[PDB]
């Protein structure tokens, strides 16, 4: 059974194992006096580990390292941040204490300094474009477009079928659309299509937040962004 907020306390992380060598980790944290769930990616990268997302904070985030040697074993030496914002970078300067080369697209870079949030080391090339995609290891980087913020990235673990959507995709749980402070709603739309679309053979998705789904959750979100459009 995949875990819930409830059962994950504040500085501790979850692996859940999704596919052969394809985990997603899951850590809570608060925000705005309550405590929400977080979920990350984790792929094998031949006898390395790639990182999607920290476990949002630097606390949850040397959790995630004390997991992932307890559980798996191998070393994480990449990790790539899927937008700014303290739930994807979050933990970053801990990464990078422990080894971990930090990756963010030159657009999530930017937003992170000038929102105060930790910085990746290294900037993504290939990602400017709504479209664009890039091979990263074991997987495929896309920008679909703006979403939950303008410079959102998913992840696509091609072996498995695994698509990672980041805060772009909610849970069928959610019916509300939150915060959506830095959010395109108009664009929302489009980049799930433009996500559907590249994306057809996807037998598993997995939101930023709560429980992984089908690619229904393109369609489940789609509707919930609409729903804050109109009313
Ligand atoms: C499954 C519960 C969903 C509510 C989450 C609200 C938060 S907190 C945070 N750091 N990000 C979000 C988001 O929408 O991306
Ligand atoms: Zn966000
Ligand atoms: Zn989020």
């Known amino acids: 059974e995949y875990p819930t907020?409830?059962?994950?306390?504040?500085?501790?992380?979850?692996?859940?194992?999704?596919?052969?060598?394809?985990?997603?980790?899951?850590?809570?944290?608060?925000?705005?006096?309550?405590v929400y769930p977080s979920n990350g990616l984790i792929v094998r990268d031949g006898d390395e580990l790639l990182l999607i997302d920290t476990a949002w904070g630097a606390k949850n985030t040397a959790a995630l390292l004390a997991e992932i040697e307890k559980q798996i074993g191998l070393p994480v030496t990449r990790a790539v941040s899927t937008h700014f914002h303290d739930d994807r970078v979050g933990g970053v300067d801990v990464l990078?204490?422990?080894?971990?080369?930090?990756?963010?697209?030159?657009?999530?870079?930017?937003?992170?300094?000038?929102?105060?949030?930790?910085?990746?080391?290294?900037?993504?090339?290939?990602?400017?474009?709504?479209?664009?995609?890039?091979?990263?290891?074991?997987?495929?980087?896309?920008?679909?477009?703006?979403?939950?913020?303008?410079?959102?990235?998913?992840?696509?673990?091609?072996?498995?079928?695994?698509?990672?959507?980041?805060?772009?995709?909610?849970?069928?749980?959610?019916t509300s659309a939150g915060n959506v402070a830095d959010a395109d709603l108009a664009e929302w739309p489009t980049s799930i299509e433009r996500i559907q679309q590249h994306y057809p053979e996807a037998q598993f998705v997995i939101p930023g937040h709560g429980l992984p789904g089908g690619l229904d959750l393109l369609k489940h979100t789609t509707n919930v962004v609409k729903a804050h459009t109109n009313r």
């Not at 409830?6 to 925000?31: C, K, M, N």
């Not at 080369?101 to 400017?128: D, F, K, M, Q």
């Open 96 to 174: 990078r204490a422990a080894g971990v080369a930090t990756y963010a697209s030159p657009s999530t870079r930017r937003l992170a300094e000038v929102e105060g949030n930790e910085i990746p080391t290294h900037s993504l090339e290939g990602l400017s474009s709504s479209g664009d995609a890039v091979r990263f290891g074991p997987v495929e980087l896309f920008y679909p477009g703006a979403a939950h913020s303008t410079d959102n990235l998913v992840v696509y673990v091609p072996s498995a079928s695994v698509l990672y959507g980041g805060c772009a995709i909610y849970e069928l749980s959610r």
């Open 5 to 34: 907020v409830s059962e994950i306390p504040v500085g501790e992380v979850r692996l859940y194992q999704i596919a052969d060598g394809v985990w997603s980790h899951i850590a809570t944290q608060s925000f705005d006096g309550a």
